[PDB]
Amino acid sequence: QRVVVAIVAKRVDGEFMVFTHSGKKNTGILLRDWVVEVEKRGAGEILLTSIDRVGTKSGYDTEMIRFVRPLTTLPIIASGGAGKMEHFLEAFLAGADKVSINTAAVENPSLITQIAQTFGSQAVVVAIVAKRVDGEFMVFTHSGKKNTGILLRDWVVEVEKRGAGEILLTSIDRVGTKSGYDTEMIRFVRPLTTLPIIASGGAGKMEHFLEAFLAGADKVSINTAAVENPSLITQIAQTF
Numbered sequence: 001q002r003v004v005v006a007i008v009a010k011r012v013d014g015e016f017m018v019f020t021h022s023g024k025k026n027t028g029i030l031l032r033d034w035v036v037e038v039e040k041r042g043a044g045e046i047l048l049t050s051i052d053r054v055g056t057k058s059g060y061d062t063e064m065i066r067f068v069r070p071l072t073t074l075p076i077i078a079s080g081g082a083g084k085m086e087h088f089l090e091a092f093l094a095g096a097d098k099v100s101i102n103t104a105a106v107e108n109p110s111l112i113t114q115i116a117q118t119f120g121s122q123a124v125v126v127a128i129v130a131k132r133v134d135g136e137f138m139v140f141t142h143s144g145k146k147n148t149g150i151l152l153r154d155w156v157v158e159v160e161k162r163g164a165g166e167i168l169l170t171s172i173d174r175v176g177t178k179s180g181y182d183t184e185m186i187r188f189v190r191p192l193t194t195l196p197i198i199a200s201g202g203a204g205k206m207e208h209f210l211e212a213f214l215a216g217a218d219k220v221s222i223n224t225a226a227v228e229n230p231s232l233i234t235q236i237a238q239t240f
């Protein structure tokens with residue numbers, strides 16, 4: 001329940017393939033096979049990111065969601081490409097249980113409110129993708145590649161105000177490094193919101209999950225290290 005497995009996928013020669021290391025590594029593993037494995041290992045939720053859709057605002061990859069839905073009984077978080085109200089409806093109709101949004105929310109924060117006021121707050125996860133810039137935490141869109149000029153402290157406050165239910169807090173610089181979560185970013189964010197925080201990016205071992213919880217994370221997300229060591233999913237699942 002505190003364990004989210006983030007699966008990043010892309011069509012490669014007609015096949016849905018799994019990507020790790022912040023979308024830089026084609027693992028050669030099929031989405032089909034990895035989804036089956038992650039549930040078997042004990043994950044509580046799946047964050048399903050269609051890496052081709054991120055930042056594009058063209059809609060969620062509902063083909064990918066429909067593909068995955070009969071493979072698993074786990075809640076699915078649709079991620080990548082949300083741009084308007086109708087996009088969320090399509091995601092739910094494809095089988096998603098919650099929806100995640102970054103780029104279009106930054107550009108139009110009232111979208112968060114629109115979603116929450118229809119599909120509640122708990123169905124809405126706002127993905128915050130941040131890093132240190134000139135000594136301050138700043139917010140980025142398009143998976144971290146595009147600046148906004150918005151401070152993390154400001155955005156966190158706004159996100160809750162607009163009615164999000166959960167924050168997915170990704171440290172751009174930690175993703176795929178397996179070097180630990182950005183616990184200073186987490187600690188920074190914790191007293192700014194009452195919302196459940198999902199720590200994202202950098203998990204490499206069991207003690208990393210511990211430090212994240214200690215810094216204030218309510219749930220933890222794992223991609224790269226889980227693919228390399230699926231039993232890690234079980235160990236953390238059996239613990240929290």
Ligand SMILES: O=P([O-])([O-])O
Nearest residue numbers: 055080081102103
């Ligand atoms: O597309 P996104 O993931 O929402 O930024």
Ligand SMILES: O=P([O-])([O-])O
Nearest residue numbers: 176201202223224
């Ligand atoms: O891959 P990740 O996100 O670092 O877990």
